[PDB]
Amino acid sequence: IVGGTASVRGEWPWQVTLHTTSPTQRHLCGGSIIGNQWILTAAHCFYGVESPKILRVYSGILNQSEIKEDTSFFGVQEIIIHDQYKMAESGYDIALLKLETTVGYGDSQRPICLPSKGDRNVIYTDCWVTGWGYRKLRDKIQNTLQKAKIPLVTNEECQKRYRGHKITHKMICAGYREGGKDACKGDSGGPLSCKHNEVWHLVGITSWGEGCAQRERPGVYTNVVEYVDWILEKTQAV
Numbered sequence: 001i002v003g004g005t006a007s008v009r010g011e012w013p014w015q016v017t018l019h020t021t022s023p024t025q026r027h028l029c030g031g032s033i034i035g036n037q038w039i040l041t042a043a044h045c046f047y048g049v050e051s052p053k054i055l056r057v058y059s060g061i062l063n064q065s066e067i068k069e070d071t072s073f074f075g076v077q078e079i080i081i082h083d084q085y086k087m088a089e090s091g092y093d094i095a096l097l098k099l100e101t102t103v104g105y106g107d108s109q110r111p112i113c114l115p116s117k118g119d120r121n122v123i124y125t126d127c128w129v130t131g132w133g134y135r136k137l138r139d140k141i142q143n144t145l146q147k148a149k150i151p152l153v154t155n156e157e158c159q160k161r162y163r164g165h166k167i168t169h170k171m172i173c174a175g176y177r178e179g180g181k182d183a184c185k186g187d188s189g190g191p192l193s194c195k196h197n198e199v200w201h202l203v204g205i206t207s208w209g210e211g212c213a214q215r216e217r218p219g220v221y222t223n224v225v226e227y228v229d230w231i232l233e234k235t236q237a238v
């Protein structure tokens with residue numbers, strides 16, 4: 001996160017840190033708890049991930065230093081990638097992780113609500129991007145979960161900023177015209193959380209951008225409201 005501040009413990013209980021154990025264990029991506037055995041993340045996170053057996057999901061974490069050999073985690077049973085996913089820049093950058101065990105909800109870990117299909121028209125005024133990512137292009141993973149309030153940007157305005165790309169309605173952009181606050185390397189997969197009528201909604205999944213927090217270069221997120229039925233299809237399967 002560029003131009004963000006340290007989070008307080010329990011501020012974002014749906015945020016998880018997805019680790020890989022191959023070749024050595026490290027933070028790979030962010031993710032959001034959306035159900036008791038479901039993590040919603042970005043499909044691009046699994047480039048060269050051949051098996052869910054090398055994945056570890058840590059919930060209820062503020063600081064990466066809370067994670068040692070003896071810290072409990074959730075194993076991943078299945079990685080579900082959207083069928084139309086090719087690359088982050090083309091959209092469909094969404095995936096579900098089906099956990100091996102059930103998440104017990106509490107003050108440190110609980111699910112975030114998906115946006116309402118009816119709320120496709122509502123304008124979110126209080127949106128925050130979170131993660132343990134870099135605070136500039138050439139940096140390292142941050143120990144403390146960072147947060148940054150960012151304004152949403154219209155599709156038309158985002159399309160102007162990304163000449164050469166096709167900014168679809170399955171993407172949602174966020175950023176300041178002057179830059180300074182954004183997601184960066186290590187934040188992808190994580191949430192773009194918007195508070196509307198005292199309830200937080202998972203409005204976006206951190207996906208891509210040209211550099212980090214550059215002026216007139218909004219961050220590009222998967223527009224979660226457009227995948228609610230896809231999510232239900234995979235999580236409510238008979």
Ligand SMILES: COC(=O)Nc1ccc(-c2cc([C@H](C[C@H]3CCCN(C(C)=O)C3)NC(=O)/C=C/c3cc(Cl)ccc3-n3cnnn3)nnc2Cl)cc1
Pocket residue numbers: 026027028029044045046047048133137140141182183184185186187188206207208209210211212213218219220221
């Ligand atoms: C000790 O542990 C560690 O150091 N762990 C560690 C783990 C992963 C990384 C990491 C992650 C990423 C991921 C994609 C990759 C995610 C993992 C899988 N993958 C590939 C290519 O293997 C894609 N992208 C973002 O996080 C956000 C993009 C982004 C998003 C927005 Cl909205 C705006 C601007 C953005 N950006 C523009 N330019 N930069 N950002 N990219 N590079 C690196 Cl090196 C670095 C360190």
